[PDB]
Amino acid sequence: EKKKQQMLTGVLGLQPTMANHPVLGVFLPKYAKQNGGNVDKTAFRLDLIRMLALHRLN
């Protein structure tokens, strides 16, 4: 849980109110099993961008 929350603050500093969002609620566990590597911080921001976008297709 501390890893999840640390990655949440690293991504954007998102508020827990946005942590409760479904796109976050599903992807934070997958972002937990990563970012322990050297990968990036920016990649996760762009990933959240495009996934949040995929989610909102009216």
Added chain:
Amino acid sequence: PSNENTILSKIFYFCVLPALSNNKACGAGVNVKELVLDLFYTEPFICP
């Protein structure tokens, strides 16, 4: 881009845009990270 579409891309980029431009064009890239930061500036509010 296949043979035809590659040919047409080079047709524009070497004939149509040059002759109508008369050497007036520029061409380059915007920053690769500050666009991501602008997206992040739009993102942190999640209300519908």
